[PDB]
């Protein structure tokens, strides 16, 4: 098809990351609003950007949730890596959660350059590595802005969601190093 | 992991690979250029301090050129990229040497061999310092001798 | 540190070293095998993205064959730095931030000899704004790989 030096033919291959589902999580995006992280063939996590909120109380009962060991430990591990990877997070009010009955659900209020919405969107940009630019509108520029007001993270069941981008573990594996690399004093 | 940042080549250079430091990157000096044969070692070795500085200077150059300047100097970018540019354990090595009264590298001055007629130079090694004063040439003479021999071996490897 | 995981050899191979990707590891493609001379570069270099993927695929293969658990996330969290170069994907993240063509780890390209059947190590097919680059935009990369193929074929 395309020959170089008359003897070397240019050939390609595309990896199907879906087969890594049993060992590592996989990030992907459905459309502009919805993005997903898949753990195995059953459980998962849905990162959705919406102008509509889902939690109105500004409390996060993590200690209660830990004691009542109902939630999936895997999903809790990736929801911790996300919140820790946020840089310069200083407005705990925007962080509101609801872990009643193991159902994990976390909401980040982006309405509250340098603001708390940048750091949460920077970490979201890394997390869903494929197809995150579609929701960002940012381009190249540090400072990230979006029309949407809330980033809602909910537990969900596995389906054929990865429509815009293929699944990949590259996003999650990168946040692991930059986990507690940027946090203020408590 | 280890550094993956590759040094960017300017548009007018004759051989793809060399790197140059402007007169504003060097104190009390004009611009200095280093050949591809020397800079190539920066991609192989993990222990060279002058290489870690080149990636810092290049990253700073690339970030200013390609990224619209922040309002008030956001530091988040370098906090992400540090391990992709420098060897953290290399500067920890110099911190160990300073603690043990050993001459260490404070990343300011470097020395190299320049052939008087061909113009090729070795990769700049760090000029060590002990108690607020750089070492005399007399105290690392045998480090310079070894570098000349490697220069000879590298020059003969072309012919 | 750096990655220490060595790729495991299958039993029906002619030379100890090569690695093969099954038809279920590749999308819309049959199985592809790569020779010892190419995969040997995975142990030397630190900068190759396709090597990082082979170590991930191999680790997933070895972990399924030898253990039983899907909270297996605890295992990869320990092993990540022994399989991949963390800063290599940070490099791609930096390139994406600077409007530079980056590698999203999906498509790769390689040169395949017409009669020898020998192949280069697959390099990553870069992408910029949701579309892979044309062959025309990295043709001098392919030219350089073809030159390395000839000098390797002579040895």
């Amino acid at each position, epitope marked *: 098809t395309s020959l170089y030096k008359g003897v070397y033919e240019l050939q390609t291959l595309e990896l199907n990351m879906e087969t890594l589902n049993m060992t590592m999580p996989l990030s992907c995006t459905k459309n502009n609003s919805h993005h997903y992280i898949m753990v195995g063939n059953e459980t998962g996590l849905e990162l959705t950007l919406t102008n509509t909120s889902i939690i109105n109380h500004k409390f996060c009962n993590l200690s209660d949730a830990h004691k009542k060991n109902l939630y999936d430990h895997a999903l809790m591990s990736i929801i911790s890596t996300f919140h820790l990877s946020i840089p310069n997070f200083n407005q705990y009010e925007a962080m509101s959660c609801d872990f009643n009955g193991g159902k994990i659900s976390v909401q980040y209020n982006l309405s509250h350059c340098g603001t708390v919405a940048n750091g949460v969107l920077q970490t979201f940009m890394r997390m869903a590595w494929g197809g995150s630019y579609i929701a960002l509108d940012s381009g190249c520029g540090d400072c990230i802005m979006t029309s949407y007001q809330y980033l809602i993270i909910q537990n969900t069941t596995w389906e054929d969601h990865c429509q815009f981008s293929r699944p990949s573990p590259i996003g999650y594996l990168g946040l692991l190093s930059q986990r507690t690399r940027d946090i203020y004093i408590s | 992991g280890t550094f993956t940042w590759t040094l960017s080549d300017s548009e007018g250079k004759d051989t793809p690979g060399g790197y140059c430091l402007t007169r504003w990157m060097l104190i009390e000096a004009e611009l200095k250029c280093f050949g591809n044969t020397a800079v190539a070692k920066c991609n192989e070795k993990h222990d060279e301090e002058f290489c870690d500085m080149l990636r810092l200077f290049d990253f700073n150059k690339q970030a200013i050129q390609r990224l619209k300047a922040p309002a008030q100097t956001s530091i988040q970018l370098i906090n992400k990229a540090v391990n992709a540019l420098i060897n953290d354990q290399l500067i920890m090595k110099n911190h160990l040497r300073d603690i043990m009264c050993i001459p260490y590298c404070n990343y300011s001055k470097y020395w190299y061999l320049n052939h008087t007629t061909t113009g090729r130079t070795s990769l700049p090694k760090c000029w060590l310092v002990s108690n607020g004063s750089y070492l005399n040439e007399t105290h690392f003479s045998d480090d310079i001798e070894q570098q000349a021999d490697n220069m000879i071996t590298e020059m003969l490897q072309k012919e | 540190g750096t990655f220490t995981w060595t790729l495991s050899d299958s039993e029906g191979k002619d030379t100890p070293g090569g690695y093969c990707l099954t038809r279920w590891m590749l999308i819309e493609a049959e199985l592809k095998c790569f020779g010892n001379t190419a995969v040997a570069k995975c142990n030397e270099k630190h900068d190759e993205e396709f090597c990082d993927m082979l170590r991930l695929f191999d680790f997933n293969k070895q972990a399924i064959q030898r253990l039983k658990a899907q909270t297996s996330i605890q295992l990869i969290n320990k092993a990540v730095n022994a399989l991949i170069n963390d800063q290599l994907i940070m490099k791609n993240h930096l390139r994406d931030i600077m409007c*530079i063509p980056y590698c999203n780890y999906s498509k790769y390209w390689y040169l395949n000899h017409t009669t020898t059947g020998r192949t280069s190590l697959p390099k990553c097919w870069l992408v910029s704004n949701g579309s892979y680059l*044309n062959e025309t*935009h990295f043709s001098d990369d392919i030219e350089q790989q*073809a030159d390395n193929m000839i000098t390797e074929m002579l040895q």
Partner: antibody, heavy 123, light 111 residues
Framework: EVQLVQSGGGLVKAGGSLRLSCAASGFTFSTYSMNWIRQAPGKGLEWVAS?????????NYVDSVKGRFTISRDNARDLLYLQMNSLRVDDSALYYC???????????????WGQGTTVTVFS | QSALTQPASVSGSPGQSITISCTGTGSDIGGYNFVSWYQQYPGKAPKLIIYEVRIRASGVSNRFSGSKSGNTASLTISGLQAEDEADYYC??????????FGGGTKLTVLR
């Protein structure tokens, strides 16, 4: 100073043929891809042809030039050629040769240009 | 196959700031960040001033600045000087060809 020295313009009858030369000076010519750009009298620049580094395995032309012009390179003598055949009147312009690098990791723009050589096709 | 839309001419008093447009489609300027700008004096070869949208070439004054928004790239010149009066061309990577040039712009430093 990195430069390119062109040669071989002149006058040619419509339908004739011409050969354009471009000689590299002071740079490892073999590692760069070479381009041809023409500029009509009192008009803008227009890219014409391209050839990849080392073996010229990757070659591109403009649709209004396909099957009539042929780009080539001799890495031994550090030369770039452009063989024009069945020359139209429109082809008459000032022709430049320029070097670049089609790389994903370290690309280069059209940094080095030739001095330019004139081609005039009369009917 | 078509060219890139540039203004025929832009003019400005000395010391003033002026901008040169360069409009294309998603196939060229919108699809790559490889826009370059060239300065051509009469009877001379084009001189590369800016490449990769924003980066200046060696020796190019900081008065020259390159930008891009969507399908349009812009070359801005502050502190207009007589030496700047020349023809300015833009070019970009393309899905269909390695390069595609603009029509060109005659910058005039009004006297």
């Amino acid at each position: 100073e990195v430069q390119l020295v062109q040669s071989g313009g002149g006058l040619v009858k419509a339908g004739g043929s011409l050969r354009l030369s471009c000689a590299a000076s002071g740079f490892t010519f073999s590692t760069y891809s070479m381009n041809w750009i023409r500029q009509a009298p009192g008009k803008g620049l227009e890219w014409v042809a391209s050839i990849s580094s080392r073996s010229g395995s990757h070659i591109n032309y403009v649709d209004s030039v396909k099957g009539r012009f042929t780009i080539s390179r001799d890495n031994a003598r550090d030369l770039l050629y452009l063989q024009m055949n069945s020359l139209r009147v429109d082809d008459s312009a000032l022709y430049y040769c320029a070097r670049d690098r089609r790389s994903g990791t370290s690309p280069l723009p059209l940094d080095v240009w030739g001095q330019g050589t004139t081609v005039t096709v009369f009917s | 196959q078509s060219a890139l839309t540039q203004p025929a001419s832009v003019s400005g008093s000395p010391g003033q700031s002026i901008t040169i447009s360069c409009t294309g489609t998603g196939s060229d300027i919108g699809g790559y960040n490889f826009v370059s700008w060239y300065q051509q004096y009469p009877g001379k070869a084009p001189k590369l001033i800016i490449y990769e949208v924003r980066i200046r070439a060696s020796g190019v004054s900081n008065r020259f600045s390159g930008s891009k928004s969507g399908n349009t790239a812009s070359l801005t010149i502050s502190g207009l000087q007589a030496e700047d009066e020349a023809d300015y061309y833009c070019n970009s990577y393309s899905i269909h060809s390695p390069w595609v040039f603009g029509g060109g712009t005659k910058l005039t430093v009004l006297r």
